[PDB]
Each structure stands twice: as C-alpha cells, then as structure tokens.
Amino acid sequence: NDKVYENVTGLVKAVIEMSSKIQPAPPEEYVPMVKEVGLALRTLLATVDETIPALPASTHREIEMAQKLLNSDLGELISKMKLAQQYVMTSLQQEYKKQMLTAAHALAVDAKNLLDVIDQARLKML
Numbered sequence: 596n597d598k599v600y601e602n603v604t605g606l607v608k609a610v611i612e613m614s615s616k617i618q619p620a621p622p623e624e625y626v627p628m629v630k631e632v633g634l635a636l637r638t639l640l641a642t643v644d645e646t647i648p649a650l651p652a653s654t655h656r657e658i659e660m661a662q663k664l665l666n667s668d669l670g671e672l673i674s675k676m677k678l679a680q681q682y683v684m685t686s687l688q689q690e691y692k693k694q695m696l697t698a699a700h701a702l703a704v705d706a707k708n709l710l711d712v713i714d715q716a717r718l719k720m721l
Contacts, residue, residue, distance in 0.1 A: 596717065598642055603706050606635045606639050606706045609632045610632060610700060621683075626676065632669070636706075654712075657716075661705070661708055664705045668698070672695065672702060
C-alpha cells in the first residue's frame with residue numbers, strides 16, 4: 596500500500612539511476628551517487644517507523660530485522676564505493692565499479708523484502 600510502497604519504489608528508482616551512472620562517471624562523482632541512495636534509504640526507514648505502531652506488535656521485531664539489513668547493505672555499498680574511489684587503475688576500477696552495482700542492487704532487493712514483510716504484517720491484521 597502506498598506510503599511504504601511509494602518510498603520503496605523511490606529507493607529502487609534511486610538504485611537504478613545510480614547504477615546507470617556508474618560506468619561513465621569518474622570517482623569524484625561516486626559519494627554523491629551513494630549519498631543520494633543513502634538519503635532515499637533514510638526516508639524509507641523513517642516512513643516504516645511511522646507505520647510500525649499501527650501494526651501488530653508481534654511483527655515489529657521482524658520488520659526491524661528487515662530495516663537493519665538495509666543499513667548493513669548501505670554499509671556494504673559505501674565499502675565497495677571506497678575501493679572504487681581509491682583505485683582508479685582500469686583493471687581495479689572496472690572490478691569495483693561492478694561490486695558497487697551488485698551491492699547497490701542487493702539494497703534494492705532487501706528494500707523489496709522489507710515491503711513484503713510490511714504486507715505480511717498488514718495481512719496479520721485480518
């Protein structure tokens with residue numbers, strides 16, 4: 596349903612458009628890309644926090660679990676990003692540009708999982 600769905604979509608969109616800009620773009624333009632995805636992530640997390648109290652208390656812990664995973668993913672992304680910033684040598688750059696993409700997408704997939712967890716909790720209200 597919308598609020599949460601809309602912000603999950605915004606995060607996926609952000610991941611797609613950061614992934615599009617990786618290949619062409621230098622390093623000097625890698626933190627900004629990740630910064631944007633991170634800001635899109637924070638908005639989604641705050642949106643889920645606002646939705647938690649209206650869901651059965653027995654679903655909280657799991658929702659939190661899905662929330663923490665995304666933070667871990669963002670950490671893994673920034674981690675790969677550091678490597679692509681430092682090593683501009685082509686062979687190393689192509690490799691780390693690739694690991695950033697893969698890590699960014701892992702985030703989009705867990706964002707979707709968080710969504711599935713919210714819907715599951717909403718259905719528990721039946």
